[PDB]
Each structure stands twice: as structure tokens, then as C-alpha cells.
Amino acid sequence: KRQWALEDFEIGRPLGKGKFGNVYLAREKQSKFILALKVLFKAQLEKAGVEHQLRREVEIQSHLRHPNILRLYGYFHDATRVYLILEYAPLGTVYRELQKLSKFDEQRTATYITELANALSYCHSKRVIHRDIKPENLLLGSAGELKIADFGWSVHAPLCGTLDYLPPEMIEGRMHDEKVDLWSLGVLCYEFLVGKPPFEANTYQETYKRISRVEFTFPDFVTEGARDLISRLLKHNPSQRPMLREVLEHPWITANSSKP
Amino acid sequence: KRQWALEDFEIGRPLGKGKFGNVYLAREKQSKFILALKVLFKAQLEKAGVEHQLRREVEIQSHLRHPNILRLYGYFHDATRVYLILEYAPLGTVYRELQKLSKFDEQRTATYITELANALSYCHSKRVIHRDIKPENLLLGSAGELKIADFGWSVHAPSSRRTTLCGTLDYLPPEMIEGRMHDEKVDLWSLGVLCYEFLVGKPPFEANTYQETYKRISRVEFTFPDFVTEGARDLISRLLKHNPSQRPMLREVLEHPWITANSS
Amino acid sequence: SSYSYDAPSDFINFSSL
Amino acid sequence: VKSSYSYDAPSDFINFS
Ligand SMILES: Nc1ncnc2c1ncn2[C@@H]1O[C@H](COP(=O)(O)OP(=O)(O)CP(=O)(O)O)[C@@H](O)[C@H]1O
Ligand SMILES: Nc1ncnc2c1ncn2[C@@H]1O[C@H](COP(=O)(O)OP(=O)(O)CP(=O)(O)O)[C@@H](O)[C@H]1O
């Protein structure tokens, strides 16, 4: 019954910019709990017309309790700002880490892929498909344990008696909607091990084209077993991609993960 | 007033039954204006996990003003029920009409197709992709004109669709890239299918099983019966192309010869 | 669960514009 | 119509601990 207010928090130093406002460190005045407070500005969300994308990403995330997913504890809003009460991730993003190390070893990658696969299983078990994951959206908690943080492209999953009227492209690709998150994992795995994604190129047009043709190469240091994994995940036809259980069981993962 | 309440409306006969409640005829007391009041049971909605789907449907449709789109004037709700205030369509669905006449002459077909293409051009104009259109979702206003009225699978297109895609491109799969390039063009298939159903009285890809229908659509396996003229064959053939991109634009469907020739 | 839609909830004078 | 910012998402004060 009691409801969030702005003066329930000690607003600390900023943690980042962001498109529609800022993220600040902060403390819940009573309990002293360290969290992160994301402030968006209503007049910028209305101007960009992204309020419903915000609503959806907040509705979806706030109903997700998982060690490897950033907790969003709640929200509230004053006349001009929207505020999101988030779990605080000290050790920055996997993007920073990957720049500072250039690439990752087998042990780090397999471990990160295990945390992504577990978080993704949970998500699906709630009829939620994440879709787009960049390393920029992957934060690190204080044990360096991995935290999925962005949900802008995520959707909640439902079907027919109506196919007579559906095009092939809605027919297919949809009702193989889980397997979109498997692609993402393949790209992250490649990227962690190699330093950059497998379809990077000069032009968006080179890139796009490569994605459809599924044309990539493996540097010589990528082990046979990582290739095996990466290759099943980057399959043109979503049907032929494995399930997240087959990824968690895959021998290369279990061979190198610092922890299950 | 400010807000709608159920007590503003006299309420008449049921206009029919939906999944989650019934549609009634109705009249606003103070102006005696005739409308339809759709009633949705919160219990059944929350038990079926479609609150957000409903929300999307009402938001999208309420912002569309077009003669060939059904007006949603407003909503309100009480403890048990959600109420939608819709324009009343006197002459029934296109589905019931289709199945009394079996099939339509080309005059009606072209007329409806024109009416449909206008409606979707407008939807597209305002960044909305309508998705599943079937005869059942097409109502008829007083002068015989089509009104699109579902939006159950309708989506706002994310805008800045060149910029917002470009930049996360390395990370999304083929499915997702094609999805967002031409989702727009999904509405062209629908025109094609419907046009076909109007002339022939059954959709192009009808089959015993969902699996065959699925293979048929997948391979674009259809054939016209004899009485279908060249101009029609031409138009449908162009609309039912496997690869979204080869489908014409609404602008080209309005201009098409067979259409202009029979559209009243 | 709250049934607030960014959609019109206000009475309309139908005799008007 | 501007947005009401009503989400189907928690807005209740929480005890931490
Ligand atoms: N819960 C959290 N804990 C610690 N740092 C956080 C955080 N959430 C965000 N940050 C930091 O502050 C920055 C703000 O990122 P934010 O999540 O607001 O991105 P955004 O989705 O709003 C725009 P973009 O998608 O281009 O990054 C992040 O880049 C990150 O470095
Ligand atoms: N505005 C209107 N004017 C006249 N008749 C209407 C109407 N809205 C609905 N109807 C009638 O009531 C029937 C059921 O309404 P509606 O189709 O809107 O409910 P519904 O969406 O739950 C069925 P579906 O399962 O296909 O989604 C329709 O088939 C139509 O004949």
C-alpha cells in the first residue's frame, strides 16, 4: 500500500548517460540498501514516442527473478521524470572487459555462455523471448557473475485456425521464436573467443549480406569443439539450432566453465 | 461529464458473441446516437493472459480515423467488465455476406479491395501494421462499405527503422532482419489472399490439414479456376509472392488496371 | 490488472464535430 | 491524451531485508 517517492533515496554519483536520462547510484534512506536509480524524462520519451517500448521493457523485466538477470525492483514517476529502481552492478559491462582483454579464454567464455543459457531458459519458461543481446547490455555483478540488463526488443510469447490468411514469413520465423535467442548466443560465443562478431564488415551491406549467406570464418586458434558449438547455433534455419539444454550439456562448455 | 459510465447508455439487442463477452447495440442517452458496446469479462481475460493484447488493440485502433476503419470512440471498465464503445456496422460481416452469395462478382471485389488498400495505406501512413485480416474481421457500414475491425495482431512499427536496426545488426539473426525490413509487406499478402477468396469463395491454400495448408502457403501452391479473368490473375499473382520484397506497393494496387476498371 | 490504456476515456458530445 | 504512465509493474515501497 505504501508507494515509492523520490525522497526515499539518497541520490549519489552518476553511473552513466543513456538516451533518455541518467543512471545514478543511490541508497534507500531507511534500509541503507545500495541500488541504482535510472531516471528518464517524460518529455523526451513522448517526443521520441518510445513510451510503450519503455512500458513493455519495464513490465517484462520487473517480473523476472533470476541471479543472472538484472532485478528491476519497481518504478514510480513524478510530473516530469520516470524512475526505475534497479539492482546495482559494480564491475561495469562485458563490453569494457572485452576491450581491455581483446578476447577471452575458453574458460571465461564457456562460463559466460552458461550464465546466458540459464538466464535464457528461465526467460523462456516465462514465455519471454529476449531477442537482441549485445555485450553492452551485459553487466557484471560484484563476483563478476553475468547480468542481462536490456530488454527493449524482448516480447511476451502467446495461435492459429487462421493460417489460411498468414504469409510464409509470419508462419515461419514465428512459431520458431525461441531459436532467435540461440543465434544471439552463437554470436556472443564467437565474439568472446575471437574479439569481434563473426559478420563484422566495412559496410552494413557487406555485413547484412553475410548474415543471410551465413558466411563466416574461424581463426586458427578457435578449437574444434568451440567451432562445433558455434556452428550449430549459427544455422540459417531456426529449426536446426539446438535447444538451451543441448548447449548447457555440450562437452566444450562443461570442459571449460569455471562453474555450472 | 468527464468520464464514460455504463449509465450513459441504453442497451439493445446482442449483435453477437465473442470469445470474451458479447457485443450489444446501444445508444448514448444525451444524444441518442447509435453505437455498439463491446463487453469483455475481466475474469476470462486474466485467465487467458490477453490483457496486454487487448491494451494494444484498443490503443492502436482508438487513434485511427478512416472511413474504412471501425471507430473505437472510447473504453471504460467497472469491477467485472471492460467496455468498448465502437461505431455500429449495420450490414454484418463480409464473411456472412460471402457465404450467402458464395462468391462476389468483380465489381464488389475490386470495390472492397480498393477500400481495403486505402485503409492499409492509411494505417501504414501512421506507422501501423495490421496483420491477420480475414472476412470475419471485415464489417459493412450503411452504404455497403468495408470497415476493418480487429487489430488483434496489430503492431506499431518501431520508427527510425533504418537507424534502429543498423547498429545492432551484427547480433540479430536473418529472421529478425527480414522481419523488420518488410513487415510492412505482410499486408500485401493478405490483400492477395482475400481478393482470391472473394472471387472464388475459398482461400487459395485451403487443405485438409494444417500441415498441407502450411506446405501449400510455404511453396505458394495455388491455381485459379477458369472463370477468373487475366487482370485478376495478374493482381493476385503479384500479391502472393513468396519473397516479401517482390510484392507491389499499395500505390501500385490502387493504380492497377483490373482495379480501376471495376472499382465503383 | 489496472486497465489504464493510453486511450480515450472521456465522454463525447456526439452531436458535435 | 498524453501517457498516464500506468504500468502493470510494482510501485510499492519494499523493505530491504
Ligand atoms: N544497474 C546498473 N548498475 C550499474 N551501472 C549501470 C546500471 N544500469 C546502467 N548502468 C551504466 O550506466 C549506463 C546507462 O546505460 P542504460 O542502461 O541507461 O542504457 P540505455 O538502454 O538507456 C541507452 P543504450 O541502449 O544506447 O545504452 C550504462 O551504459 C552502464 O554503463
Ligand atoms: N461494431 C459492430 N457492429 C456490428 N456488429 C458487430 C460489431 N462488433 C462486433 N459485431 C458482431 O459481433 C460478432 C462478435 O464480435 P467480435 O468479432 O468483435 O468479437 P471477437 O473479436 O471476440 C470474435 P473473434 O474471436 O473473431 O476475435 C462479430 O462477428 C460481428 O458480427
Residue numbers in the entry:
A (entry chain D): 125 to 282, 289 to 390
B (entry chain A): 125 to 388
C (entry chain B): 6 to 22
D (entry chain E): 4 to 20
Authors' description from the paper:
Aurora A, a Ser/Thr kinase, is a key regulator of mitotic events, including mitotic entry, centrosome maturation, and spindle formation. Aurora A depletion leads to cell cycle arrest, while overexpression has been found in many cancer cell lines. TPX2 recruits Aurora A to the spindle microtubules, an event that is essential in spindle formation. Here we investigate two fundamentally distinct regulation mechanisms by characterizing autophosphorylation of Aurora A as well as activation by TPX2 (Targeting Protein for Xklp2).
We first solved the crystal structure of dephosphorylated Aurora A in the absence and presence of TPX21−45 and bound to an ATP-mimic (β,γ-methyleneadenosine 5′ triphosphate, AMPPCP). Comparison of dephosphorylated Aurora A in the absence or presence of TPX2 reveals subtle but significant interactions by which TPX2 stabilizes the active form of the kinase. First, binding of TPX2 causes a slight rotation of the αC-helix towards the catalytic center, thus allowing for the conserved, stabilizing E181-K162 ion pair to form. The αC-helix rotation also results in movement of F275 of the conserved DFG motif from the DFG-out into the DFG-in position (bottom inset). Second, movement of F275 initiates a cascade of side chain interactions that result in the completion of the regulatory spine originating from the αF-helix (R-spine). From these structural features it appears that Aurora A, despite being dephosphorylated, is in an active conformation when bound to TPX2. Curiously, the last two hallmarks of the active state are created by a swap of the activation segments of Aurora A resulting in a dimer conformation that has not been previously reported for this protein. In contrast we find an asymmetric dimer within the unit cell with monomer I showing complete electron density for the activation segment while monomer II is missing residues 283–288 (red and blue, respectively). In addition, only monomer I has the perfect geometry of the conserved hydrogen bond network found in a catalytically prone kinase between residues D256, K258, and T292. Therefore we speculated that monomer I may be the enzyme molecule recognizing monomer II as its substrate.
